[PDB]
PDB file of C-alpha atoms in Angstrom:
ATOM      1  CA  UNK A   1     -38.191 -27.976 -23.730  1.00 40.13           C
ATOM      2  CA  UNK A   2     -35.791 -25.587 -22.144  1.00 44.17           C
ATOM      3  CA  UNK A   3     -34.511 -25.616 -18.658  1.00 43.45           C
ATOM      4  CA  UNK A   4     -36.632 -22.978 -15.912  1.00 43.05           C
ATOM      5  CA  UNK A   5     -34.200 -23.388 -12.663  1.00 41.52           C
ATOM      6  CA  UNK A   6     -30.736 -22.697 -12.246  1.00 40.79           C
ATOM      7  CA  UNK A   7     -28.764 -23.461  -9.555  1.00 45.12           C
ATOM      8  CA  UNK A   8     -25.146 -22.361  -8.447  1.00 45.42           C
ATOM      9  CA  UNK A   9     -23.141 -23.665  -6.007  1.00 44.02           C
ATOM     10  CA  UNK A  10     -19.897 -22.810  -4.337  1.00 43.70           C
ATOM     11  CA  UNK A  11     -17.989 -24.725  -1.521  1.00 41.91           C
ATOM     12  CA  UNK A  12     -15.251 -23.569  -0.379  1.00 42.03           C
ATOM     13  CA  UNK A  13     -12.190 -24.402   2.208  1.00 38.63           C
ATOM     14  CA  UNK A  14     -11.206 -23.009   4.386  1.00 37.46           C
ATOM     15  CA  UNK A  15     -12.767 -20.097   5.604  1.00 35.44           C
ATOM     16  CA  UNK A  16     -12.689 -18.250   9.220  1.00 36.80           C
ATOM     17  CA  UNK A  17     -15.700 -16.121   9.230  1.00 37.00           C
ATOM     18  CA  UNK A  18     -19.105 -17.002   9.436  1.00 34.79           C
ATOM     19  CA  UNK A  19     -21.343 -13.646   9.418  1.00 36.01           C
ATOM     20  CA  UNK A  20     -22.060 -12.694   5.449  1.00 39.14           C
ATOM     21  CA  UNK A  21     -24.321 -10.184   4.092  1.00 38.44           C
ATOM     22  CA  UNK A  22     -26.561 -10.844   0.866  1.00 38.32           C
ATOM     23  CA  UNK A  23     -27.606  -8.497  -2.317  1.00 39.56           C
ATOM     24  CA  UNK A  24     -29.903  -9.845  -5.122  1.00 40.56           C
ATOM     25  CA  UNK A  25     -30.219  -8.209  -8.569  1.00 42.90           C
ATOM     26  CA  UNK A  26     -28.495  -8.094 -11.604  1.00 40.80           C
ATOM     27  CA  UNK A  27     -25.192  -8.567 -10.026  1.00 38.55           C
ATOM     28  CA  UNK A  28     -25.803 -10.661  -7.170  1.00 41.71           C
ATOM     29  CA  UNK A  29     -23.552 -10.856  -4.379  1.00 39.57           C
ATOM     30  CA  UNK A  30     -22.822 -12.603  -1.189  1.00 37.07           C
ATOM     31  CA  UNK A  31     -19.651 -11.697   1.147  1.00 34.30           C
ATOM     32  CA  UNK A  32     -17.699 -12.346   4.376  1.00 36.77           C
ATOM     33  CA  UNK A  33     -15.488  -9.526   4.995  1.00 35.28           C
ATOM     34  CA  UNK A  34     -12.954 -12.145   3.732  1.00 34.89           C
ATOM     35  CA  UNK A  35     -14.524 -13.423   0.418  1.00 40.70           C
ATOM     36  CA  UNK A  36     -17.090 -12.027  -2.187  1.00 36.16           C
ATOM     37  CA  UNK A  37     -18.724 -14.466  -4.415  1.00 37.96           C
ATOM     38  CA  UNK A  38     -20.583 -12.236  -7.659  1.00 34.88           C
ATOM     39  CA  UNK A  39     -23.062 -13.988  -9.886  1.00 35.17           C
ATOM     40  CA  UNK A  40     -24.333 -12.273 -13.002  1.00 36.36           C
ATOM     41  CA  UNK A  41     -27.119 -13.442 -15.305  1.00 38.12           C
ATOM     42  CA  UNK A  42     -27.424 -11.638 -18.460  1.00 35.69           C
ATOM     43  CA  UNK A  43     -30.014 -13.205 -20.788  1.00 33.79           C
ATOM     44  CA  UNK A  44     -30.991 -15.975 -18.657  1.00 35.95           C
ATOM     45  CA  UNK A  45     -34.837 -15.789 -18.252  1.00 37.06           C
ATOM     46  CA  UNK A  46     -35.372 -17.728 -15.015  1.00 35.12           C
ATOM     47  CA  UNK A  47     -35.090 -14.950 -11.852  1.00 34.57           C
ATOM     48  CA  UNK A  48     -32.549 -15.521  -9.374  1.00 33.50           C
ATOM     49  CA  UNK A  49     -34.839 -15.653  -5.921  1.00 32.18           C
ATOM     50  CA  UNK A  50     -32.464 -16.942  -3.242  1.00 34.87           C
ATOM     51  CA  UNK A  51     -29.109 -17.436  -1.715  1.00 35.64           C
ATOM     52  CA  UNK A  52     -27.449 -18.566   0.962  1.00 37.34           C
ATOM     53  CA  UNK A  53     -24.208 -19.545   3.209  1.00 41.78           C
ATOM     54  CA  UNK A  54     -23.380 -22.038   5.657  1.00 43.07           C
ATOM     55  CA  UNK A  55     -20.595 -23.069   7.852  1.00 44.33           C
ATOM     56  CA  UNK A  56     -19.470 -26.278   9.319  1.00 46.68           C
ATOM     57  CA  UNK A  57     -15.956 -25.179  11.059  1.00 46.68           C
ATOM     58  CA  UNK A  58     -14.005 -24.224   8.370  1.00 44.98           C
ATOM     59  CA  UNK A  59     -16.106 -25.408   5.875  1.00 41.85           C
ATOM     60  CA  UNK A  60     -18.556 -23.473   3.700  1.00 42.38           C
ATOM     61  CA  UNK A  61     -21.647 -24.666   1.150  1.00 41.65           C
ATOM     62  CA  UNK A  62     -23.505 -21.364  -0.558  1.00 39.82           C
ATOM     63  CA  UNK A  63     -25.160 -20.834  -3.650  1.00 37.18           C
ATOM     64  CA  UNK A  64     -27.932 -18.714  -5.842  1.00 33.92           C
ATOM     65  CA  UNK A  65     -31.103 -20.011  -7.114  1.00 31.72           C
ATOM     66  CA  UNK A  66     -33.969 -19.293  -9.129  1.00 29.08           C
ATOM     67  CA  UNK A  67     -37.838 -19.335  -8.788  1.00 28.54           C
ATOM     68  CA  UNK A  68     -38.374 -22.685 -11.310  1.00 26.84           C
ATOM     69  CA  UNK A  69     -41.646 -21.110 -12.554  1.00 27.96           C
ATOM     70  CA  UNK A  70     -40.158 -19.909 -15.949  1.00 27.55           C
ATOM     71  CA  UNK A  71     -38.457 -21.527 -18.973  1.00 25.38           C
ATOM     72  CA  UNK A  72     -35.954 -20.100 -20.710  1.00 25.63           C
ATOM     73  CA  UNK A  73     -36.348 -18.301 -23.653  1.00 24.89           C
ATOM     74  CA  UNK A  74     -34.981 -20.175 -26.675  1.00 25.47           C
ATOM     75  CA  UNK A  75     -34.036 -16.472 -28.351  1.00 26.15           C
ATOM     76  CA  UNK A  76     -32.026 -15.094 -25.986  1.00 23.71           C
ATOM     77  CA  UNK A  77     -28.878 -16.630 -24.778  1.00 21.71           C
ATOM     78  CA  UNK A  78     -28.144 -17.371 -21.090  1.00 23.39           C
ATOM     79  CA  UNK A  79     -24.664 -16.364 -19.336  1.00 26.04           C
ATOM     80  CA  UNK A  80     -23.629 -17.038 -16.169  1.00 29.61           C
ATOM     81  CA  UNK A  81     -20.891 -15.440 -14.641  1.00 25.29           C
ATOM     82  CA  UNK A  82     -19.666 -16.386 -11.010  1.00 29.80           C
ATOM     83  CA  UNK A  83     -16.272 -14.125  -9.814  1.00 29.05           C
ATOM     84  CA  UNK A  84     -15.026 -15.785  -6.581  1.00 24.77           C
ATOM     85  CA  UNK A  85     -12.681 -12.716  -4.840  1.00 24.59           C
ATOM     86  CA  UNK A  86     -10.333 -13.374  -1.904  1.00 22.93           C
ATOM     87  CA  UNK A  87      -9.819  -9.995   0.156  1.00 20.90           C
ATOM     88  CA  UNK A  88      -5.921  -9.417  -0.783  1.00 19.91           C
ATOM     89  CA  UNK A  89      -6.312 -11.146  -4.344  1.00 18.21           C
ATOM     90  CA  UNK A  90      -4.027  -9.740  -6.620  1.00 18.54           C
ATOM     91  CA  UNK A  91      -4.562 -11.853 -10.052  1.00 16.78           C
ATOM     92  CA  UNK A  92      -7.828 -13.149 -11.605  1.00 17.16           C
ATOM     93  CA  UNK A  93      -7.700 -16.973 -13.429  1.00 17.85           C
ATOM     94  CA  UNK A  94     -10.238 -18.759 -14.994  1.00 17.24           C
ATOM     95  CA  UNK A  95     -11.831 -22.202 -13.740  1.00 22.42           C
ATOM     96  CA  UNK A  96     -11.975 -25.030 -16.251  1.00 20.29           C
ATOM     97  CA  UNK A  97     -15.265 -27.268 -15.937  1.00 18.76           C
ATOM     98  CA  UNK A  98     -15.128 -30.955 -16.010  1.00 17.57           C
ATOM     99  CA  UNK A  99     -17.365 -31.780 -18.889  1.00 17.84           C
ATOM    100  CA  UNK A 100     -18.201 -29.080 -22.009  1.00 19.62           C
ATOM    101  CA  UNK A 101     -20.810 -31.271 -23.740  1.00 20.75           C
ATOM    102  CA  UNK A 102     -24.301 -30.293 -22.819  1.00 20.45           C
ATOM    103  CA  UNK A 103     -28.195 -30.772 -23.486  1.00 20.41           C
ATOM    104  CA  UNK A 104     -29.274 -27.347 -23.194  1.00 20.20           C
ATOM    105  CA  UNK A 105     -27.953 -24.079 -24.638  1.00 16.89           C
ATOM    106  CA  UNK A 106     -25.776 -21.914 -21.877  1.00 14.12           C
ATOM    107  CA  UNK A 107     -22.432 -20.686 -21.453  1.00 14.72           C
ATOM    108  CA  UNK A 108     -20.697 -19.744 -18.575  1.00 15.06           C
ATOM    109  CA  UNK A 109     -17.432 -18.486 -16.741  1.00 15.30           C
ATOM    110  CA  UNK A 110     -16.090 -19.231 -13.179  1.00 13.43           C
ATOM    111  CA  UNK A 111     -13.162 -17.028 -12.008  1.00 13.43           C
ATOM    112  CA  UNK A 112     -11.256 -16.842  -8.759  1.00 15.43           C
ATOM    113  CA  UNK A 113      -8.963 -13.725  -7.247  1.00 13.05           C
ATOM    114  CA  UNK A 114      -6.365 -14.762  -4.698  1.00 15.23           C
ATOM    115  CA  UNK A 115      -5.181 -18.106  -3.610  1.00 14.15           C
ATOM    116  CA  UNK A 116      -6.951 -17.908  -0.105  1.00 11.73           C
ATOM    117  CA  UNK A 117      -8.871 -21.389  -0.734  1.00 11.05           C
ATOM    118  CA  UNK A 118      -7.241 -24.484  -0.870  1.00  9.77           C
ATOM    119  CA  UNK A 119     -10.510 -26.326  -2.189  1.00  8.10           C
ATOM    120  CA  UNK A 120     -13.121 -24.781  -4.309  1.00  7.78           C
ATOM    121  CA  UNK A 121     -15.537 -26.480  -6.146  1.00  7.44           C
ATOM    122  CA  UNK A 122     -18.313 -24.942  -8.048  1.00  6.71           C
ATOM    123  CA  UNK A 123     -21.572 -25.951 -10.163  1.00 11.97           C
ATOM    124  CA  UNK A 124     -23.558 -24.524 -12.368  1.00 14.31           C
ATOM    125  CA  UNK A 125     -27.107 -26.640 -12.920  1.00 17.52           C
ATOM    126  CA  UNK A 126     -29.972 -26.185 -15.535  1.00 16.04           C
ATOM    127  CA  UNK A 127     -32.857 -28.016 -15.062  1.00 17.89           C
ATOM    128  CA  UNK A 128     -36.307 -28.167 -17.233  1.00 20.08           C
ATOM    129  CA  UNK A 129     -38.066 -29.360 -13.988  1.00 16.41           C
ATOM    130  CA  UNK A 130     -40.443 -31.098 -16.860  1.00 19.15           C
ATOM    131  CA  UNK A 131     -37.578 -33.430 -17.435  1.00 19.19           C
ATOM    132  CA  UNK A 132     -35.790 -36.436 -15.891  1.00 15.87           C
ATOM    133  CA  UNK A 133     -33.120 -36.081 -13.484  1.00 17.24           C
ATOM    134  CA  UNK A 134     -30.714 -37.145 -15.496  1.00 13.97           C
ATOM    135  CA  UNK A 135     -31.544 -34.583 -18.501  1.00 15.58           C
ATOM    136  CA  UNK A 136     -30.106 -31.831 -16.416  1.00 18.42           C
ATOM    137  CA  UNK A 137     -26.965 -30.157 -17.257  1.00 15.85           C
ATOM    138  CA  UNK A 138     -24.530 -30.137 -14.818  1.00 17.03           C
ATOM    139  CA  UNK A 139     -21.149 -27.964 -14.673  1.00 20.35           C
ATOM    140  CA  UNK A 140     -18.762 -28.493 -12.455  1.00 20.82           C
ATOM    141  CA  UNK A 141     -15.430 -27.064 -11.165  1.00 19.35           C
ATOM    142  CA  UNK A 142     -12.855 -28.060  -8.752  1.00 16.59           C
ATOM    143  CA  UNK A 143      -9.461 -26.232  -7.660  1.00 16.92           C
ATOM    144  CA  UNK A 144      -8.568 -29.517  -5.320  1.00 17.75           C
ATOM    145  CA  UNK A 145      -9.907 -32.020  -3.354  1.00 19.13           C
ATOM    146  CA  UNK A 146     -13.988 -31.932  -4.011  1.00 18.49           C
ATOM    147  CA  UNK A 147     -15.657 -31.211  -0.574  1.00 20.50           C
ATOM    148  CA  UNK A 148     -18.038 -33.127   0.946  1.00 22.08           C
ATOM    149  CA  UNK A 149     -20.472 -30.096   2.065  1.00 19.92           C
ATOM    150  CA  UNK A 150     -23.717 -32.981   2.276  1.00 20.54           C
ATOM    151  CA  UNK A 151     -26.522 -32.059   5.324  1.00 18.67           C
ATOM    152  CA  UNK A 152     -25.435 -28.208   5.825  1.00 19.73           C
ATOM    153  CA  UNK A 153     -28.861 -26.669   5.037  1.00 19.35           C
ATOM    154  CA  UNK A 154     -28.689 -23.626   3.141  1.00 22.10           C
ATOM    155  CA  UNK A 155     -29.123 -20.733   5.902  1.00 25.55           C
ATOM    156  CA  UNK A 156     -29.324 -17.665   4.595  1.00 24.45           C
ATOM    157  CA  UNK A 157     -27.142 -14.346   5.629  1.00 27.11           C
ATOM    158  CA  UNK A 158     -30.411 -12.480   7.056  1.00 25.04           C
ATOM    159  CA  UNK A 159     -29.476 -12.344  11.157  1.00 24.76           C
ATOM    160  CA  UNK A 160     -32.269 -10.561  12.117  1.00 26.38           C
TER     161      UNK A 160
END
């Protein structure tokens, strides 16, 4: 079986501002006026539904997430791209994950702009929800020091 939820992750230190606004779609975004995280999904069948961003001081836990409804089609190839971009970010680099063998086709790219966090750690998670825990794949990135960002519920930017 193939996976039918993904779910991305970012957590990031420090940051100052709280207030971020969201936009779904085919490039999905969510941004401070200080940092703009950009997922794409070309290929990947599962439909990213929601987002979200919250702040304990300084420290932020956000991430995308699809409607787990779906599997993946075994034709078409998923790739996720996630562009972290700091507001005076001059150079792009490319995140290394921690592992590279997996259970379930994918392939995906992490890049960060600007040296305006000291820790960020992102992952990347397919899951066939028909499947054990352990079965999912799990891909996971870390600048620094990996944040503890456990009990911040996932608020999303909608203020209304």
């Amino acid at each position: 079986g193939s996976f039918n939820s993904i779910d991305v992750e970012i957590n990031m230190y420090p940051v100052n501002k709280t207030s971020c606004n969201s936009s779904i779609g085919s490039s999905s975004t969510i941004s401070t006026s200080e940092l703009t995280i950009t997922l794409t999904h070309e290929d990947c069948t599962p439909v990213f539904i929601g987002d979200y961003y919250s702040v304990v001081d300084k420290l932020a836990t956000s991430g995308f997430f699809t409607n787990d409804k779906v599997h993946q089609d075994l034709t078409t190839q998923c790739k996720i791209n996630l562009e972290i971009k700091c507001n005076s970010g001059r150079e792009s680099r490319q995140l290394t994950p921690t592992t590279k063998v997996y259970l379930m086709p994918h392939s995906e790219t992490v890049t960060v702009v600007g040296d305006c966090l000291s820790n960020l750690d992102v992952y990347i998670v397919y899951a066939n929800t028909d499947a054990i825990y352990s079965d999912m794949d799990v891909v996971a990135y870390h600048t620094s020091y990996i944040l503890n960002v456990d009990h911040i519920p996932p608020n999303d930017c909608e203020r209304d």
